[PDB]
Amino acid sequence: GLTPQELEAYGISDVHDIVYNPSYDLLYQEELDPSLTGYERGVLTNLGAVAVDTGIFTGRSPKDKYIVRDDTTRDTFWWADKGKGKNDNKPLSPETWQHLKGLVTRQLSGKRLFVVDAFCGANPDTRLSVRFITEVAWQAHFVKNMFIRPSDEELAGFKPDFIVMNGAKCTNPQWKEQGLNSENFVAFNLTERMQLIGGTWYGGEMKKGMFSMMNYLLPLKGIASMHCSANVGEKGDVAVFFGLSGTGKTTLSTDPKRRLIGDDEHGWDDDGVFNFEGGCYAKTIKLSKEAEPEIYNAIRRDALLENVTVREDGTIDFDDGSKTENTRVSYPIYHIDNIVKPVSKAGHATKVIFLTADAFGVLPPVSRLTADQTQYHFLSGFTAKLAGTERGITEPTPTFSACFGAAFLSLHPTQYAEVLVKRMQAAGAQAYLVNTGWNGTGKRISIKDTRAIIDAILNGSLDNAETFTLPMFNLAIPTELPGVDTKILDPRNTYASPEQWQEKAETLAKLFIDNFDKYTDTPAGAALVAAGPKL
Ligand SMILES: Nc1ncnc2c1ncn2[C@@H]1O[C@H](COP(=O)(O)OP(=O)(O)OP(=O)(O)O)[C@@H](O)[C@H]1O
Ligand SMILES: [Mg+2]
Numbered sequence: 428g429l430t431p432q433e434l435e436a437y438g439i440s441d442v443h444d445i446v447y448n449p450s451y452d453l454l455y456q457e458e459l460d461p462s463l464t465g466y467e468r469g470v471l472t473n474l475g476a477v478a479v480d481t482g483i484f485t486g487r488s489p490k491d492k493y494i495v496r497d498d499t500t501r502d503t504f505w506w507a508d509k510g511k512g513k514n515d516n517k518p519l520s521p522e523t524w525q526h527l528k529g530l531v532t533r534q535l536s537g538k539r540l541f542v543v544d545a546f547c548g549a550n551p552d553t554r555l556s557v558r559f560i561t562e563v564a565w566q567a568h569f570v571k572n573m574f575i576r577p578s579d580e581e582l583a584g585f586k587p588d589f590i591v592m593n594g595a596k597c598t599n600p601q602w603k604e605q606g607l608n609s610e611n612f613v614a615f616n617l618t619e620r621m622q623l624i625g626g627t628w629y630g631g632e633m634k635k636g637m638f639s640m641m642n643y644l645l646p647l648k649g650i651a652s653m654h655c656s657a658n659v660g661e662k663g664d665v666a667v668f669f670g671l672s673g674t675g676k677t678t679l680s681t682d683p684k685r686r687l688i689g690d691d692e693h694g695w696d697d698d699g700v701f702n703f704e705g706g707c708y709a710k711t712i713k714l715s716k717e718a719e720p721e722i723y724n725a726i727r728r729d730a731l732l733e734n735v736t737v738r739e740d741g742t743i744d745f746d747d748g749s750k751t752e753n754t755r756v757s758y759p760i761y762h763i764d765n766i767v768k769p770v771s772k773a774g775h776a777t778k779v780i781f782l783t784a785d786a787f788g789v790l791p792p793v794s795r796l797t798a799d800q801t802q803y804h805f806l807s808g809f810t811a812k813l814a815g816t817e818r819g820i821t822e823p824t825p826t827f828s829a830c831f832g833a834a835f836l837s838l839h840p841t842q843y844a845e846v847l848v849k850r851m852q853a854a855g856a857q858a859y860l861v862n863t864g865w866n867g868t869g870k871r872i873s874i875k876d877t878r879a880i881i882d883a884i885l886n887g888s889l890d891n892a893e894t895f896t897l898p899m900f901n902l903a904i905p906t907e908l909p910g911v912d913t914k915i916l917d918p919r920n921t922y923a924s925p926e927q928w929q930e931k932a933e934t935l936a937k938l939f940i941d942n943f944d945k946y947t948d949t950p951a952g953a954a955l956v957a958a959g960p961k962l
């Protein structure tokens with residue numbers, strides 16, 4: 428086993444108590460310690476799972492994300508200040524990084540620390556060995572759930588490729604003088620291979636931080652790194668589901684008719700699709716046991732609820748979004764019965780689905796994309812929401828996040844597109860666009876109906892059917908689909924008149940066109956006629 432006399436070369440001193448590779452049982456007792464108060468304290472729910480409060484931050488803080496610009500990242504990273512498109516990869520000086528490291532290492536010094544060694548990536552040949560350090564038990568619990576838990580043997584000869592140090596309790600008072608966004612920070616240094624977290628307690632920063640690193644390393648090696656869920660059928664056929672947050676990746680991949688590979692982060696190499704994680708991070712707002720049985724059943728001892736409202740009697744009010752709409756629950760992947768094991772990976776994907784929640788109510792429930800349209804929509808990374816479905820009234824607001832996850836991209840969008848296209852062509856994969864959002868009714872299509880569309884896609888029903896073309900976006904949609912209302916197939920029918928759809932389609936088309944303009948600086952990018960909507 429490891430010894431305390433080997434964990435101070437990171438700049439952490441005077442650690443008297445070291446809890447290495449904490450067990451779920453110890454994490455439980457740490458979280459429910461009767462004398463524990465504050466944000467570290469968890470509460471036991473009637474479901475047997477512990478629930479915690481992540482504080483001020485209930486989601487990621489992109490504005491506080493920084494990457495050190497040195498000679499390791501200078502000419503490879505997609506920088507926020509290099510006009511190559513808008514992104515959160517803000518350059519940080521090596522000097523300021525040292526200051527931040529100082530804050531975090533001092534905050535963790537003289538404290539009882541949890542050290543969790545885990546893997547990011549199901550394949551030994553490309554996975555990262557990560558060592559997580561924190562003084563908060565539930566943060567250690569979060570990483571234990573979300574990352575791949577190594578075997579006793581692997582832990583014996585564990586050699587960290589990356590170090591993640593969570594100093595949530597500390598803040599940076601010099602941020603103004605350093606030109607940073609706030610007193611908080613989520614910084615990355617690829618030379619020292621380390622991630623620092625200050626101010627925010629949100630565990631998600633650790634999960635996506637390593638995802639961001641995988642997104643840097645894998646594509647440069649010819650391996651696609653994807654923000655998608657993935658599952659496989661009895662026949663062995665594999666599907667991947669891309670989409671921005673809340674579009675359905677986790678909800679829809681957890682499907683009774685297929686084995687779950689992963690719900691959020693995957694790679695695609697010469698052998699196939701593999702999960703980067705050892706757990707799932709499901710959304711719990713308005714959670715329905717009837718609609719999502721598997722996910723609900725996963726909420727038990729060892730799962731970790733985040734920010735949900737817990738009543739005096741321990742019952743959970745999943746509908747309460749008064750604190751945040753981003754209530755979550757993390758759990759080891761085996762909390763889902765029908766998953767792929769012992770290793771979360773499978774063959775090449777033959778079905779690539781792009782999920783989008785179109786608040787504009789213009790995109791059809793399902794359409795088959797051409798090769799060029801696949802690239803166009805991948806780079807577009809579209810989804811929409813109302814200016815405030817909990818704030819004001821209707822006002823569809825678009826979000827164009829390249830590759831369906833710009834916030835996690837370390838390389839240029841085209842680099843992800845290139846590797847994805849290569850893997851797709853070699854596998855003869857077909858792409859589909861699915862609107863898990865709204866139509867003319869103003870009400871989101873039901874999960875039941877959506878699972879039916881996915882069923883049709885995966886079993887070939889969609890491909891082996893006649894289609895017509897939706898104008899403006901020129902999307903091929905089937906005339907009918909088993910277990911699906913034929914009326915909704917054409918979004919124009921959910922409106923009192925096709926004219927209403929027309930006006931909104933025109934607006935959305937213009938948004939797409941304007942958003943894509945930045946990619947036309949290359950001959951290939953000039954592929955404006957592709958999926959490219961046309962007025
Ligand atoms: N037709 C539908 N299809 C999918 N999800 C739906 C549908 N209708 C409502 N929802 C809800 O929308 C949300 C989709 O969330 P999900 O967790 O799948 O997003 P995600 O794509 O996995 O996001 P992230 O990448 O942030 O984890 C869930 O809360 C789900 O209950
Ligand atoms: Mg998800």
Ligand SMILES: [Mn+2]
Nearest residue numbers: 654671672691
């Ligand atoms: Mn995600």
